[PDB]
Amino acid sequence: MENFQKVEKIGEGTYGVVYKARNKLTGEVVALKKIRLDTETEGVPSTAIREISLLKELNHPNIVKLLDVIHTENKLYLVFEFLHQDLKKFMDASALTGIPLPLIKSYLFQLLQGLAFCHSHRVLHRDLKPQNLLINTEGAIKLADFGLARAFGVPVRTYTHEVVTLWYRAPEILLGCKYYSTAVDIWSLGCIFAEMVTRRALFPGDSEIDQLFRIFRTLGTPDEVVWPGVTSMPDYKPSFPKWARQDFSKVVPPLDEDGRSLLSQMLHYDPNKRISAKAALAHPFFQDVTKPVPH
Amino acid sequence: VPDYHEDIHTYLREMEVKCKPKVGYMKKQPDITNSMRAILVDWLVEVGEEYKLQNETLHLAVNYIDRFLSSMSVLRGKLQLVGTAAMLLASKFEEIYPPEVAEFVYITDDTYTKKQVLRMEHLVLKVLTFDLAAPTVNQFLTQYFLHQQPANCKVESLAMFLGELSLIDADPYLKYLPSVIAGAAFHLALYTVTGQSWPESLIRKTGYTLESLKPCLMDLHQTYLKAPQHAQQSIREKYKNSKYHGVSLLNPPETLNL
Amino acid sequence: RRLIF
Secondary structure, three states: OOOOOOOOEEEEEEEEEEEEEEEOOOEEEEEEEEHHHHHHHHHHHHOHHHHHHHHHOOOOOOOOOOEEEEOOOOOEEEEOOOEEEHHHHHHHHHOOOOOHHHHHHHHHHHHHHHHHHHHHEEEEEOOOOHHHEEOOOOOEEEOOOOOOOOOOOOOOOEEEEEEEEHHHHHHHHHHOOOOOOOOHHHHHHHHHHHHHHHOOOOOEEEOOHHHHHHHHHHOOOOOOOOOOHHOOOOOOOOOOOOOOOHHHHHHHOOOHHHHHHHHHHHHOOOOOOOOOHHHHHHOHHHHOOOOOOOO | OOOHHHHHHHHHHHHHOOOOOOOHHHHHOOOOOOHHHHHHHHHHHHEEEEEEEOOOHHHHHHHHHHHHOOOOEEEOHHHHHHHHHHHHHHHHHOOOOOOOOOHHHHOOOOOHHHHHHHHHHHHHHHHHHHOOOOOHHHHHHHHHHOOOOOOOOHHHHHHEEEEEHHHHHHHOOOOOOOOHHHHHHHHHHHHHHHHHOOOOHHHHOOOHHHHHHHHHHHHHHHHHOOOOOOOOOOOHHOOOHHHHOOOOOOOOOOOOOO | OOOOO
């Protein structure tokens, strides 16, 4: 820790105050997360148990590098690679013009790559959303904040009262599914892909039930044909309105047919049919991909 | 999305070799022994029942404990502190919300303080280098169960049951990787309920032939026959519940007819 | 319980 000089606080979150810092010996700039933890009650929290153990196995260009973990009597410092801001902050500032399409293409390509690496190493991210995606100035984007990420060597039992964040939750979670699957990360990403395109949230609900219905109203109320098992999902109700799917063209205007194709596959209602990250990468929407730089 | 079913199984096979403990370890431990390791794991089986924890959490805690005694000498009076710490860590990693530290302390009857528990947590994490995502027998079985034709609930419970028994006895089971024990228990449970055999699917999936499974399987058969006698019995008691179709009862085949 | 070792 003596080799690190604190430069400035760069926001907070889980763990507390994140600081930008510079290694005095190597010159490297770093993001320091500090976990005062509780040295009399709870110990290391699970978020850090998870983020550390899982990140240590996930070395990828589109996943933030945990560079080090420093231990002492009563502090645990985590040293991460530095990236100056998140997609949420970059979207709030790109409202007016919008993130240009080719930069959305490149962010989605990279995000799918990192998520593909996660899924194939049996890790569900679990909390994919714009504030948990970081960017540099050269056009890279990375999955961050693995605090809720979980290994799936055995299926992951869901929270009963979900915590993750309403607007990016998959309808299976909204319907009380018992286990998560890789698909829930895909749904989040597709909602994120939409949000970058149209500048608004895809399904900005105001309650769990309103969220379900905002989804049902846009993509149509699902049924056994579309989604084998729906009527049997724990929180399904026969009284749910049967909406007919509106036109997807008007839902994501700027997207060409290829983009709409990919988006609708990332938002399939049945989890087993939802496109995976691996296949999404071969989608034609990515044949003209480049790496532009954001302004 | 089983486009990763392959990769996951492949990756867990890669990680089980990296999360393996020193086979010899109990030998080079001047105060603790297998039989005491046996009592501790049997105890964790019940701490698990008391707090209605996942079997995976129980498997994970055993892996941590072995990997920890592989590098650190522990006196018998502190053994229960290692394990107690490993269950907390395992609980934090695997459970939706872990038990409070204070409960892990309570179940010891104050043989350790809350701070001593937290301190050991910390030490367990240094020694393990935060490598808590260890593959387990229970993880391999689950992956194997997708290849049954079709799923026989009694076969799943009983395989699970035999997998736990193997946690109790470093005695032989530390010499096999989790996937092999998993293989052996599945063949054994299947064989016990129906008379069928390590399916071709799995042979093709695992790269394991029945013959490759034969040493561990003979050990596991011995353990199954000998189980009503064992000093430790929390597992059999756990598996008498309707939850597992009481498989713990059915009579072990006296021969493997292998 | 304290573990008898």
